[PDB]
Amino acid sequence: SGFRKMAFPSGKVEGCMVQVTCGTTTLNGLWLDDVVYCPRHVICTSEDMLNPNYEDLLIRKSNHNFLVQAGNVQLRVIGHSMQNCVLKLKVDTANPKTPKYKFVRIQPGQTFSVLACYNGSPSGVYQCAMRPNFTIKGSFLNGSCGSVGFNIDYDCVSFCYMHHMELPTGVHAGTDLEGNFYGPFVDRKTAQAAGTDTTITVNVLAWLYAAVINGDRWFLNRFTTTLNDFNLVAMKYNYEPLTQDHVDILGPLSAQTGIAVLDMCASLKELLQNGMNGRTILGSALLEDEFTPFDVVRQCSGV
Amino acid sequence: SGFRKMAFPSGKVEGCMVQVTCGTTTLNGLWLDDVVYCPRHVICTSEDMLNPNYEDLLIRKSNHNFLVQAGNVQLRVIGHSMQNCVLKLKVDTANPKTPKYKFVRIQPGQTFSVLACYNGSPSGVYQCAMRPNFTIKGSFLNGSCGSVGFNIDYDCVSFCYMHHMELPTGVHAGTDLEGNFYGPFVDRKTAQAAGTDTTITVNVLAWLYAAVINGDRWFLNRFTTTLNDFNLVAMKYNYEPLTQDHVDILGPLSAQTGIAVLDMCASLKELLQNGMNGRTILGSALLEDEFTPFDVVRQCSG
Ligand SMILES: *[C@](O)(C(=O)NCc1ccccc1)[C@H](C[C@@H]1CCNC1=O)NC(=O)[C@H](CC1CC1)n1cccc(NC(=O)OC(C)(C)C)c1=O
Ligand SMILES: *[C@](O)(C(=O)NCc1ccccc1)[C@H](C[C@@H]1CCNC1=O)NC(=O)[C@H](CC1CC1)n1cccc(NC(=O)OC(C)(C)C)c1=O
């Protein structure tokens, strides 16, 4: 038993991380087969960053201007191509530890593991939700750019995030592995801000389910609410509306505990309205919204 | 920017995980060079247990009774011994993926990463602290036994924990990799009680420095305290004593923030006496005690 924020084992991704230097700029790339993927802003000086003409900056770069290091081995670059905000560097050597992988775009409210790297060396691993405002609550310093976010399903790595930037309020923005930003963000040194965030109602209910499965159950009550009457209180507190698809997605946790979603909703309404009165749920004194229903099932059934 | 509960990358440990089976029981083993380490209770059934005589039960096992699988390769067991509560199984093959490593016994308040495994297959990585009562707050289901805790120093993996058992209210116990339990626990099927836990004071101060490094400053007051006057208040709220050694260990964070340790103690004293009054620190509504000073410096620096 017990319930913890849990990342995927990162070994399959660690074997792909490399360092990419272009003149003065060093950051991280992802080496899969004979291609290294990284943020295109590797070609910029801070001069270029106010309004960078990436197409014109890239014309002035040769294969030779890209230093790619995997451990203590130099990889020779034999081709460069740009796709949206990502640079693809073709190398002579294919990554022999390339795992089975796909590039996917995660939806808001879904979770992934971040492998934070510096100089192409993994430093740490932690779990993030793609927020409704298309930011993540991460931990990234200078050199973290080109760090990736992923899910593992069996032997297959689904790469969903490459790190690009920090925003006021200490949150982070990046692109999918095709180089499209999540949210309205741009890869240049302009003032940008995240929109107002919302709480991911479906994820809070999943976590309440997690609590109950682990025997932390003091917040359960005999009361029930309609979906409409629940959503009246949710909207006031800046929680996403709960849809019938959310109620259906919570079906496995509801069946496993025997607590109906609309019974659980009466707990959550009381917690929103009256707070926790000095008590904790799974060691937290506030409502956690960064576990998906699938994250709870995976951890409580142990795959 | 941002501050997260962070684990070490697990790759170097993933390549060491194997499945150990003795008839009916399967759990995880750690394969380093030509030795597999696993909990000794892999030799029991329900038949035994409640209070098994492990030395006795191990006599009546043979090398061949240990099925060791590394992915879908069978390892040949050519030797076996018990050391405290772990089995060391000698195998015909050295692990090609053995990282540079040590075995260390960690102290209460120290943190480590857990790679939770099922059938020799890693499932997840998370960060833990050795509580003052020598339990950990883990996430471990049936089959998790033999999962290990570790720190990574540069290239070198320090193994500090092997998972053995669950205790009341969802907490966990295990041994070091020499098979000595952390705490007054035994690998018996019998009821055992943890002992009352306390807050790791040096770790709360470390995390208040993390808060200041990351732009959370509201809880700083303009007071200082003596070590003694601080501990008078700490002990009243179930906090570990803060030693001069803890003050000295908070030095680097002190210098990096220009907030003296005893000034930060005066801020914590006020937080214990008056509460947080519904405000958060680094996204938490209570005081977090599972970041060491080392963890704060590591994450804020590289
Ligand atoms: C990323 O580019 C990176 O790591 N680059 C390599 C490098 C940088 C610095 C020194 C050595 C090597 C960084 C990652 C950032 C830095 C701190 N934590 C992070 O997540 N991203 C940027 O610096 C980014 C580049 C832009 C998108 C193309 N950038 C540029 C300018 C400003 C910001 N943000 C910013 O100033 O935000 C506030 C909160 C205002 C400080 C930015 O992210
Ligand atoms: C460990 O043995 C394991 O994972 N392998 C055994 C196994 C069981 C079922 C199927 C396949 C393999 C487990 C790990 C436990 C299970 C639940 N969570 C864990 O972390 N260890 C034990 O079951 C352990 C063995 C004892 C030390 C030698 N054990 C046995 C009996 C009771 C408990 N604890 C217990 O019941 O705790 C209370 C607080 C009473 C609920 C126990 O840990």
From Swiss-Prot, chain A:
Protein's recorded name: 3C-like proteinase nsp5
Active-site feature positions: H41, C145
Assembly mode: 3CL-PRO exists as monomer and homodimer. Only the homodimer shows catalytic activity. Interacts with host FBXO22; this interaction promotes the proteasomal degradation of nsp5.
Domain of life the protein comes from: Viruses
Catalysed reactions, semicolon-separated: TSAVLQ-|-SGFRK-NH2 and SGVTFQ-|-GKFKK the two peptides corresponding to the two self-cleavage sites of the SARS 3C-like proteinase are the two most reactive peptide substrates. The enzyme exhibits a strong preference for substrates containing Gln at P1 position and Leu at P2 position
Role this protein plays: Cleaves the C-terminus of replicase polyprotein at 11 sites. Recognizes substrates containing the core sequence [ILMVF]-Q-|-[SGACN]. Cleaves and inactivates human TRMT1, preventing tRNA guanine(26)-dimethylation of tRNAs. May cleave human NLRP1 in lung epithelial cells, thereby activating the NLRP1 inflammasome pathway. May cleave human GSDMD, triggering alternative GSDME-mediated epithelial cell death upon activation of the NLRP1 inflammasome, which may enhance the release interleukins 1B, 6, 16 and 18. Also able to bind an ADP-ribose-1''-phosphate (ADRP).
Cytoplasmic side: 1-303
Organism: Severe acute respiratory syndrome coronavirus 2 (2019-nCoV)
Position(s), cross-link Glycyl lysine isopeptide (Lys-Gly) (interchain with G-Cter in ubiquitin): K5, K90
Subcellular location field: Host cytoplasm; Host Golgi apparatus; Host nucleus
Record annotation: effect of changing L205V: In strain: Zeta/P.2
Activity modulation comment: Inhibited by pyridone-containing alpha-ketoamides compounds 13a and 13b. In turn, alpha-ketoamide 13b (tert-butyl (1-((S)-1-(((S)-4-(benzylamino)-3,4-dioxo-1-((S)-2-oxopyrrolidin-3-yl)butan-2-yl)amino)-3-cyclopropyl-1-oxopropan-2-yl)-2-oxo-1,2-dihydropyridin-3-yl)carbamate) inhibits SARS-CoV-2 replication in human lung cells. Inhibited ex vivo by michael acceptor inhibitor N3. Inhibited ex vivo by compound 11a and 11b.
Peptidase C30 domain residues: 1-303
From Swiss-Prot, chain B:
Spans within the Cytoplasmic topological domain: 1-302
Organism: Severe acute respiratory syndrome coronavirus 2
Mutation effect (N142A): Does not affect ability to cleave and inactivate human TRMT1
Record's subcellular location: Host cytoplasm; Host Golgi apparatus; Host nucleus
Known outcome of mutating P132H: In strain: Omicron/BA.1, Omicron/BA.2, Omicron/BA.2.12.1, Omicron/BA.2.75, Omicron/BA.4, Omicron/BA.5, Omicron/BQ.1.1, Omicron/XBB.1.5, Omicron/EG.5.1
The protein's name in its UniProt record: 3C-like proteinase nsp5
Effect annotated for changing K90R: In strain: Beta/B.1.351
Regulation: Inhibited by pyridone-containing alpha-ketoamides compounds 13a and 13b. In turn, alpha-ketoamide 13b (tert-butyl (1-((S)-1-(((S)-4-(benzylamino)-3,4-dioxo-1-((S)-2-oxopyrrolidin-3-yl)butan-2-yl)amino)-3-cyclopropyl-1-oxopropan-2-yl)-2-oxo-1,2-dihydropyridin-3-yl)carbamate) inhibits SARS-CoV-2 replication in human lung cells. Inhibited ex vivo by michael acceptor inhibitor N3. Inhibited ex vivo by compound 11a and 11b.
Top-level division of the source organism's lineage: Viruses
Recorded catalytic activity of this chain's protein: TSAVLQ-|-SGFRK-NH2 and SGVTFQ-|-GKFKK the two peptides corresponding to the two self-cleavage sites of the SARS 3C-like proteinase are the two most reactive peptide substrates. The enzyme exhibits a strong preference for substrates containing Gln at P1 position and Leu at P2 position
Residue window of the full protein shown: 3264 to 3565 of 4405
Effect of C145A: Complete loss of 3C-like proteinase nsp5 cleavage
Peptidase C30 domain sequence ranges: 1-302
Job description of the protein: Cleaves the C-terminus of replicase polyprotein at 11 sites. Recognizes substrates containing the core sequence [ILMVF]-Q-|-[SGACN]. Cleaves and inactivates human TRMT1, preventing tRNA guanine(26)-dimethylation of tRNAs. May cleave human NLRP1 in lung epithelial cells, thereby activating the NLRP1 inflammasome pathway. May cleave human GSDMD, triggering alternative GSDME-mediated epithelial cell death upon activation of the NLRP1 inflammasome, which may enhance the release interleukins 1B, 6, 16 and 18. Also able to bind an ADP-ribose-1''-phosphate (ADRP).
Active-site annotation: H41, C145
Covalent cross-link (Glycyl lysine isopeptide (Lys-Gly) (interchain with G-Cter in ubiquitin)), residues: K5, K90
Quaternary assembly: 3CL-PRO exists as monomer and homodimer. Only the homodimer shows catalytic activity. Interacts with host FBXO22; this interaction promotes the proteasomal degradation of nsp5.
